[PDB]
PDB file of C-alpha atoms in Angstrom:
ATOM      1  CA  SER A   1      86.027  96.342  91.391  1.00 39.43           C
ATOM      2  CA  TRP A   2      88.314  98.414  93.601  1.00 41.23           C
ATOM      3  CA  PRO A   3      91.254  97.752  95.902  1.00 38.89           C
ATOM      4  CA  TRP A   4      90.063  97.651  99.465  1.00 38.15           C
TER       5      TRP A   4
ATOM      6  CA  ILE B   1      83.146  97.170 107.098  1.00 39.90           C
ATOM      7  CA  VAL B   2      79.549  97.666 105.967  1.00 36.83           C
ATOM      8  CA  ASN B   3      76.921  96.359 108.441  1.00 37.05           C
ATOM      9  CA  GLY B   4      79.379  95.326 111.090  1.00 35.94           C
ATOM     10  CA  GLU B   5      79.465  96.293 114.713  1.00 37.08           C
ATOM     11  CA  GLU B   6      81.813  97.963 117.117  1.00 37.34           C
ATOM     12  CA  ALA B   7      84.429  95.671 118.619  1.00 35.40           C
ATOM     13  CA  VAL B   8      85.161  95.291 122.303  1.00 37.33           C
ATOM     14  CA  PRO B   9      88.198  97.565 122.832  1.00 34.50           C
ATOM     15  CA  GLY B  10      91.442  95.622 122.791  1.00 35.15           C
ATOM     16  CA  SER B  11      89.831  92.339 121.744  1.00 36.81           C
ATOM     17  CA  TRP B  12      91.617  92.098 118.363  1.00 36.75           C
ATOM     18  CA  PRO B  13      95.109  92.801 119.664  1.00 35.21           C
ATOM     19  CA  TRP B  14      96.975  92.009 116.420  1.00 35.96           C
ATOM     20  CA  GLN B  15      95.006  94.615 114.462  1.00 35.60           C
ATOM     21  CA  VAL B  16      97.129  97.607 113.463  1.00 37.10           C
ATOM     22  CA  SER B  17      96.390 100.782 111.547  1.00 35.97           C
ATOM     23  CA  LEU B  18      98.729 101.989 108.820  1.00 34.44           C
ATOM     24  CA  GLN B  19      98.798 105.770 108.819  1.00 35.32           C
ATOM     25  CA  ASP B  20     100.660 108.218 106.625  1.00 36.30           C
ATOM     26  CA  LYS B  21     102.631 111.127 107.996  1.00 37.02           C
ATOM     27  CA  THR B  22      99.485 113.323 108.091  1.00 38.14           C
ATOM     28  CA  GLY B  23      97.829 110.826 110.455  1.00 35.46           C
ATOM     29  CA  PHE B  24      95.451 109.459 107.811  1.00 33.22           C
ATOM     30  CA  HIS B  25      94.469 105.778 108.165  1.00 31.79           C
ATOM     31  CA  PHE B  26      94.788 104.079 104.786  1.00 32.59           C
ATOM     32  CA  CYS B  27      95.087 100.334 105.470  1.00 29.66           C
ATOM     33  CA  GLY B  28      95.044  97.721 108.171  1.00 31.44           C
ATOM     34  CA  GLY B  29      97.561  95.048 109.063  1.00 29.40           C
ATOM     35  CA  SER B  30      98.206  92.261 111.564  1.00 28.45           C
ATOM     36  CA  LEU B  31     101.065  91.714 113.993  1.00 27.25           C
ATOM     37  CA  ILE B  32     102.605  88.246 113.602  1.00 30.22           C
ATOM     38  CA  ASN B  33     105.336  88.820 116.220  1.00 28.33           C
ATOM     39  CA  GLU B  34     106.918  91.831 117.951  1.00 29.31           C
ATOM     40  CA  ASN B  35     108.934  92.839 114.903  1.00 29.85           C
ATOM     41  CA  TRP B  36     106.748  92.053 111.868  1.00 31.47           C
ATOM     42  CA  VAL B  37     103.416  93.144 110.412  1.00 32.39           C
ATOM     43  CA  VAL B  38     101.540  91.488 107.541  1.00 32.87           C
ATOM     44  CA  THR B  39      99.496  93.710 105.214  1.00 33.66           C
ATOM     45  CA  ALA B  40      98.391  93.877 101.563  1.00 33.64           C
ATOM     46  CA  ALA B  41     100.935  94.638  98.845  1.00 29.78           C
ATOM     47  CA  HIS B  42      98.526  97.000  97.122  1.00 28.38           C
ATOM     48  CA  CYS B  43      98.486  99.249 100.206  1.00 28.35           C
ATOM     49  CA  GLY B  44     101.714 100.732  98.878  1.00 30.82           C
ATOM     50  CA  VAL B  45     103.367 101.206 102.243  1.00 29.13           C
ATOM     51  CA  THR B  46     106.623 103.183 102.426  1.00 28.25           C
ATOM     52  CA  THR B  47     109.137 103.694 105.222  1.00 30.04           C
ATOM     53  CA  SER B  48     107.551 107.149 105.837  1.00 29.28           C
ATOM     54  CA  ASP B  49     104.306 105.521 106.969  1.00 28.82           C
ATOM     55  CA  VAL B  50     103.625 104.519 110.587  1.00 26.32           C
ATOM     56  CA  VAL B  51     102.209 101.374 112.203  1.00 29.83           C
ATOM     57  CA  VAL B  52      99.818 102.148 115.025  1.00 29.01           C
ATOM     58  CA  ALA B  53      99.243  99.322 117.532  1.00 30.43           C
ATOM     59  CA  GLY B  54      96.898  99.215 120.508  1.00 33.43           C
ATOM     60  CA  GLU B  55      94.338 101.571 119.032  1.00 37.31           C
ATOM     61  CA  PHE B  56      90.556 101.315 119.326  1.00 41.26           C
ATOM     62  CA  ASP B  57      89.175 104.828 118.814  1.00 42.00           C
ATOM     63  CA  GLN B  58      91.130 106.885 116.304  1.00 41.80           C
ATOM     64  CA  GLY B  59      89.374 109.989 117.656  1.00 41.10           C
ATOM     65  CA  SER B  60      90.661 109.552 121.190  1.00 45.42           C
ATOM     66  CA  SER B  61      93.762 111.258 122.628  1.00 48.62           C
ATOM     67  CA  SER B  62      93.733 109.170 125.801  1.00 50.10           C
ATOM     68  CA  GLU B  63      94.592 105.666 124.504  1.00 54.68           C
ATOM     69  CA  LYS B  64      98.029 104.266 125.183  1.00 54.38           C
ATOM     70  CA  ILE B  65      98.934 103.520 121.598  1.00 53.91           C
ATOM     71  CA  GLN B  66     102.263 102.528 120.099  1.00 53.05           C
ATOM     72  CA  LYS B  67     103.418 104.367 116.984  1.00 51.72           C
ATOM     73  CA  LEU B  68     106.032 102.174 115.360  1.00 54.55           C
ATOM     74  CA  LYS B  69     108.429 103.087 112.587  1.00 57.60           C
ATOM     75  CA  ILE B  70     109.000 100.860 109.597  1.00 58.25           C
ATOM     76  CA  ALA B  71     112.543  99.726 108.762  1.00 58.81           C
ATOM     77  CA  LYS B  72     111.917  97.849 105.535  1.00 62.42           C
ATOM     78  CA  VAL B  73     109.053  96.919 103.211  1.00 60.17           C
ATOM     79  CA  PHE B  74     109.099  93.373 101.757  1.00 58.55           C
ATOM     80  CA  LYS B  75     106.651  93.156  98.911  1.00 58.40           C
ATOM     81  CA  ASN B  76     106.152  89.541  97.810  1.00 57.22           C
ATOM     82  CA  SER B  77     108.013  89.080  94.515  1.00 60.25           C
ATOM     83  CA  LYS B  78     105.058  87.117  93.130  1.00 60.41           C
ATOM     84  CA  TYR B  79     102.665  90.062  93.604  1.00 59.22           C
ATOM     85  CA  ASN B  80     100.955  90.890  90.334  1.00 56.96           C
ATOM     86  CA  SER B  81      99.521  94.391  90.380  1.00 60.35           C
ATOM     87  CA  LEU B  82      97.561  93.863  87.204  1.00 64.10           C
ATOM     88  CA  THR B  83      95.467  91.060  88.741  1.00 64.90           C
ATOM     89  CA  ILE B  84      96.048  91.909  92.422  1.00 64.42           C
ATOM     90  CA  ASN B  85      97.188  88.323  92.969  1.00 65.49           C
ATOM     91  CA  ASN B  86      99.595  87.334  95.777  1.00 66.32           C
ATOM     92  CA  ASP B  87      98.578  90.542  97.584  1.00 68.68           C
ATOM     93  CA  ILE B  88     100.892  90.442 100.603  1.00 67.91           C
ATOM     94  CA  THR B  89     103.644  92.620 102.048  1.00 68.14           C
ATOM     95  CA  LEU B  90     105.676  92.183 105.214  1.00 66.96           C
ATOM     96  CA  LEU B  91     106.799  95.191 107.259  1.00 68.11           C
ATOM     97  CA  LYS B  92     109.852  94.877 109.463  1.00 69.75           C
ATOM     98  CA  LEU B  93     109.576  97.340 112.318  1.00 68.82           C
ATOM     99  CA  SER B  94     112.443  99.555 113.389  1.00 72.67           C
ATOM    100  CA  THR B  95     111.205  99.539 116.955  1.00 72.45           C
ATOM    101  CA  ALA B  96     109.657  96.307 118.345  1.00 74.15           C
ATOM    102  CA  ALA B  97     106.103  96.362 119.551  1.00 75.47           C
ATOM    103  CA  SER B  98     105.662  95.898 123.289  1.00 74.44           C
ATOM    104  CA  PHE B  99     103.158  93.088 123.784  1.00 75.54           C
ATOM    105  CA  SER B 100     100.505  93.620 126.428  1.00 74.79           C
ATOM    106  CA  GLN B 101      96.848  92.900 127.056  1.00 75.04           C
ATOM    107  CA  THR B 102      95.930  94.969 123.991  1.00 74.22           C
ATOM    108  CA  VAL B 103      98.873  94.210 121.645  1.00 74.08           C
ATOM    109  CA  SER B 104      99.800  90.638 120.634  1.00 75.13           C
ATOM    110  CA  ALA B 105     100.134  88.329 117.640  1.00 73.46           C
ATOM    111  CA  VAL B 106      97.784  86.394 115.403  1.00 72.15           C
ATOM    112  CA  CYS B 107      98.632  82.794 114.453  1.00 69.84           C
ATOM    113  CA  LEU B 108      99.666  81.794 110.969  1.00 70.51           C
ATOM    114  CA  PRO B 109      98.320  78.628 109.375  1.00 70.23           C
ATOM    115  CA  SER B 110     100.315  75.722 108.020  1.00 69.84           C
ATOM    116  CA  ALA B 111     100.396  75.588 104.226  1.00 67.53           C
ATOM    117  CA  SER B 112      98.311  72.400 104.324  1.00 72.29           C
ATOM    118  CA  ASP B 113      95.581  73.676 106.701  1.00 71.35           C
ATOM    119  CA  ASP B 114      91.991  73.376 105.487  1.00 72.82           C
ATOM    120  CA  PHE B 115      89.356  76.059 106.020  1.00 71.77           C
ATOM    121  CA  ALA B 116      86.120  74.758 104.521  1.00 68.23           C
ATOM    122  CA  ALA B 117      83.492  76.738 102.635  1.00 67.18           C
ATOM    123  CA  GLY B 118      80.708  77.649 105.022  1.00 66.84           C
ATOM    124  CA  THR B 119      82.980  78.193 108.003  1.00 66.34           C
ATOM    125  CA  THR B 120      82.170  81.424 109.843  1.00 69.35           C
ATOM    126  CA  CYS B 121      85.198  83.678 110.302  1.00 72.58           C
ATOM    127  CA  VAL B 122      85.710  87.286 111.383  1.00 73.08           C
ATOM    128  CA  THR B 123      87.153  90.374 109.742  1.00 71.30           C
ATOM    129  CA  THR B 124      88.022  93.679 111.436  1.00 74.62           C
ATOM    130  CA  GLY B 125      89.021  97.182 110.460  1.00 75.30           C
ATOM    131  CA  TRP B 126      88.456 100.903 110.206  1.00 75.26           C
ATOM    132  CA  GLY B 127      87.243 100.851 106.616  1.00 71.00           C
ATOM    133  CA  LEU B 128      84.139 102.636 105.398  1.00 71.53           C
ATOM    134  CA  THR B 129      80.843 101.655 106.987  1.00 71.26           C
ATOM    135  CA  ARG B 130      78.808 102.950 104.050  1.00 71.25           C
ATOM    136  CA  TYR B 131      79.687 103.694 100.475  1.00 76.46           C
TER     137      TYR B 131
ATOM    138  CA  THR C   1      84.785 106.397 108.095  1.00 74.51           C
ATOM    139  CA  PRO C   2      84.543 105.091 111.586  1.00 76.65           C
ATOM    140  CA  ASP C   3      86.640 106.247 114.520  1.00 82.78           C
ATOM    141  CA  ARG C   4      86.086 102.959 116.351  1.00 84.24           C
ATOM    142  CA  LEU C   5      87.253  99.546 115.248  1.00 86.92           C
ATOM    143  CA  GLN C   6      84.549  97.424 113.582  1.00 87.98           C
ATOM    144  CA  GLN C   7      84.085  93.683 113.295  1.00 90.83           C
ATOM    145  CA  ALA C   8      81.876  91.317 111.326  1.00 88.12           C
ATOM    146  CA  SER C   9      81.389  87.604 111.078  1.00 89.46           C
ATOM    147  CA  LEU C  10      81.035  86.139 107.607  1.00 91.54           C
ATOM    148  CA  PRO C  11      81.292  82.806 105.808  1.00 91.44           C
ATOM    149  CA  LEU C  12      84.038  81.468 103.593  1.00 91.49           C
ATOM    150  CA  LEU C  13      83.127  80.561  99.994  1.00 91.44           C
ATOM    151  CA  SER C  14      84.798  78.078  97.627  1.00 92.39           C
ATOM    152  CA  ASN C  15      86.737  79.567  94.704  1.00 89.02           C
ATOM    153  CA  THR C  16      84.517  77.651  92.265  1.00 84.00           C
ATOM    154  CA  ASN C  17      81.423  79.340  93.688  1.00 84.06           C
ATOM    155  CA  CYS C  18      83.173  82.709  93.997  1.00 82.29           C
ATOM    156  CA  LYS C  19      83.813  82.514  90.221  1.00 81.88           C
ATOM    157  CA  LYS C  20      80.057  82.755  89.648  1.00 83.84           C
ATOM    158  CA  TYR C  21      80.404  86.388  90.862  1.00 81.89           C
ATOM    159  CA  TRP C  22      83.913  87.320  89.729  1.00 82.84           C
ATOM    160  CA  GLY C  23      84.802  85.008  86.896  1.00 79.31           C
ATOM    161  CA  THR C  24      88.427  84.578  85.906  1.00 78.19           C
ATOM    162  CA  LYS C  25      89.512  87.355  88.290  1.00 79.02           C
ATOM    163  CA  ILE C  26      89.663  84.710  91.061  1.00 77.11           C
ATOM    164  CA  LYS C  27      93.099  83.072  91.301  1.00 73.36           C
ATOM    165  CA  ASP C  28      94.432  80.259  93.529  1.00 69.31           C
ATOM    166  CA  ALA C  29      96.067  82.749  95.950  1.00 68.78           C
ATOM    167  CA  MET C  30      92.697  84.333  96.669  1.00 71.92           C
ATOM    168  CA  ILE C  31      89.873  83.267  99.000  1.00 68.98           C
ATOM    169  CA  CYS C  32      86.377  84.741  98.993  1.00 71.65           C
ATOM    170  CA  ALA C  33      84.188  85.488 101.986  1.00 70.94           C
ATOM    171  CA  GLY C  34      80.920  87.266 102.623  1.00 69.83           C
ATOM    172  CA  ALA C  35      77.925  87.799 100.346  1.00 67.92           C
ATOM    173  CA  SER C  36      76.110  87.428 103.641  1.00 66.79           C
ATOM    174  CA  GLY C  37      74.834  90.909 104.503  1.00 67.56           C
ATOM    175  CA  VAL C  38      78.223  92.408 105.414  1.00 70.46           C
ATOM    176  CA  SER C  39      81.208  93.531 103.375  1.00 73.92           C
ATOM    177  CA  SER C  40      84.759  94.696 103.834  1.00 76.28           C
ATOM    178  CA  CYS C  41      85.246  98.090 102.218  1.00 76.87           C
ATOM    179  CA  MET C  42      87.789 100.785 101.334  1.00 78.44           C
ATOM    180  CA  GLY C  43      90.206 101.263 104.190  1.00 80.13           C
ATOM    181  CA  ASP C  44      89.859  97.672 105.432  1.00 80.07           C
ATOM    182  CA  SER C  45      92.534  96.520 102.995  1.00 77.43           C
ATOM    183  CA  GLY C  46      95.505  94.783 104.527  1.00 79.98           C
ATOM    184  CA  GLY C  47      93.665  93.784 107.662  1.00 78.63           C
ATOM    185  CA  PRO C  48      92.750  90.331 108.861  1.00 76.43           C
ATOM    186  CA  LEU C  49      90.259  87.623 108.066  1.00 77.58           C
ATOM    187  CA  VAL C  50      90.662  85.252 111.007  1.00 77.81           C
ATOM    188  CA  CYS C  51      89.126  81.873 111.718  1.00 77.05           C
ATOM    189  CA  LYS C  52      89.300  79.975 115.018  1.00 76.65           C
ATOM    190  CA  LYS C  53      91.200  76.652 114.752  1.00 78.19           C
ATOM    191  CA  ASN C  54      91.966  74.498 117.805  1.00 76.11           C
ATOM    192  CA  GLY C  55      90.982  77.419 120.095  1.00 75.91           C
ATOM    193  CA  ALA C  56      93.216  80.049 118.479  1.00 75.13           C
ATOM    194  CA  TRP C  57      92.537  82.755 115.953  1.00 75.00           C
ATOM    195  CA  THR C  58      94.446  82.068 112.737  1.00 71.25           C
ATOM    196  CA  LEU C  59      95.054  84.420 109.828  1.00 73.14           C
ATOM    197  CA  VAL C  60      93.283  82.930 106.832  1.00 74.14           C
ATOM    198  CA  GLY C  61      92.949  86.010 104.629  1.00 75.46           C
ATOM    199  CA  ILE C  62      94.222  89.535 104.083  1.00 78.58           C
ATOM    200  CA  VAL C  63      91.557  92.025 102.967  1.00 82.27           C
ATOM    201  CA  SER C  64      92.294  92.647  99.276  1.00 82.12           C
ATOM    202  CA  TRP C  65      89.537  93.751  96.860  1.00 82.71           C
ATOM    203  CA  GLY C  66      85.919  93.432  95.958  1.00 79.46           C
ATOM    204  CA  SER C  67      82.892  95.361  94.799  1.00 80.16           C
ATOM    205  CA  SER C  68      83.530  99.047  94.111  1.00 78.44           C
ATOM    206  CA  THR C  69      80.318  99.827  96.129  1.00 75.47           C
ATOM    207  CA  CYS C  70      81.003  97.356  98.969  1.00 75.77           C
ATOM    208  CA  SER C  71      77.824  95.474  98.093  1.00 79.08           C
ATOM    209  CA  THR C  72      76.769  93.162 100.892  1.00 77.99           C
ATOM    210  CA  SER C  73      75.400  90.585  98.476  1.00 78.07           C
ATOM    211  CA  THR C  74      78.726  90.094  96.628  1.00 79.83           C
ATOM    212  CA  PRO C  75      81.726  88.251  98.109  1.00 80.47           C
ATOM    213  CA  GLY C  76      84.856  90.059  99.120  1.00 80.05           C
ATOM    214  CA  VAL C  77      88.219  88.797  97.981  1.00 80.52           C
ATOM    215  CA  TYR C  78      91.077  88.185 100.383  1.00 84.69           C
ATOM    216  CA  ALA C  79      94.670  87.072  99.871  1.00 83.31           C
ATOM    217  CA  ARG C  80      94.791  83.364 100.783  1.00 84.10           C
ATOM    218  CA  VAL C  81      97.374  83.054 103.556  1.00 82.70           C
ATOM    219  CA  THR C  82      97.927  79.301 103.216  1.00 83.18           C
ATOM    220  CA  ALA C  83      99.261  79.961  99.692  1.00 84.34           C
ATOM    221  CA  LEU C  84     101.615  82.645 100.997  1.00 83.58           C
ATOM    222  CA  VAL C  85     102.862  81.367 104.340  1.00 86.56           C
ATOM    223  CA  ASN C  86     105.942  79.628 102.998  1.00 86.77           C
ATOM    224  CA  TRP C  87     107.141  83.005 101.639  1.00 86.85           C
ATOM    225  CA  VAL C  88     106.388  84.597 105.031  1.00 86.42           C
ATOM    226  CA  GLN C  89     108.470  82.038 106.825  1.00 87.92           C
ATOM    227  CA  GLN C  90     111.358  82.254 104.243  1.00 87.90           C
ATOM    228  CA  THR C  91     111.361  86.057 104.675  1.00 90.38           C
ATOM    229  CA  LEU C  92     111.393  86.010 108.460  1.00 90.07           C
ATOM    230  CA  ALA C  93     114.180  83.375 108.500  1.00 91.45           C
ATOM    231  CA  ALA C  94     116.429  85.399 106.199  1.00 92.76           C
ATOM    232  CA  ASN C  95     115.913  88.868 107.813  1.00 93.39           C
TER     233      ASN C  95
ATOM    234  CA  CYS D   1      99.618  83.448 119.267  1.00 92.46           C
ATOM    235  CA  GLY D   2      95.944  83.822 118.591  1.00 91.42           C
ATOM    236  CA  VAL D   3      94.484  84.028 122.098  1.00 91.16           C
ATOM    237  CA  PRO D   4      93.462  87.570 123.068  1.00 92.21           C
ATOM    238  CA  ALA D   5      93.743  88.642 126.703  1.00 97.48           C
ATOM    239  CA  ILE D   6      90.455  90.557 126.254  1.00 97.98           C
ATOM    240  CA  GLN D   7      87.951  88.163 124.755  1.00 99.05           C
ATOM    241  CA  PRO D   8      86.049  89.276 121.670  1.00 99.89           C
ATOM    242  CA  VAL D   9      82.260  89.334 121.851  1.00103.05           C
ATOM    243  CA  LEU D  10      80.543  88.474 118.566  1.00104.43           C
TER     244      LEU D  10
END
């Protein structure tokens, strides 16, 4: 996951 | 947005761009009235960043955009950066936005409103189109 | 990155079904959307997920997080505005 | 709120  | 399409200019009039002092777009946001923008807490906005309203093409010099200064950042006290839960910040603008054909507010829901699985909604932004 | 503003339509998921993708990372103040051939991606964060209700566009989500490769077959995760709107209104009223 | 002056085309 990654902050968008 | 991956596999989206270009919007009609001005058709999402609450959409703002959050830019740093170098002019770099790093996050979106939404106008909820002339003085307040909603964005994500994890965007890490500071009062040195700028809210840009009325923009369509970030490569154009000819658009009548509004560059609005931020007075105060209100990060929701329930935001949990470890889980990215409650990911919301409010920005109070120093200078009110001037509403027009291309700049206006989105509605907020009631707390009890229902949006069912399977409903088709829309998202907008200047994020990457390919990874 | 694009110069011009992009849009996409996409469906809302239930949190129970979103947990098949993301497991215990999905909390009550999140809502999932997508897995439909489109995805939000880096730089979309903070922007809107809007749904039309009684003729008006209403802010249902705030772009938050998702797949590190913006996979179009995995749902994106958005902050669930109905869970947060009471804090919005308390903040506006006090400031 | 919520009603753009320039209608979106989806």
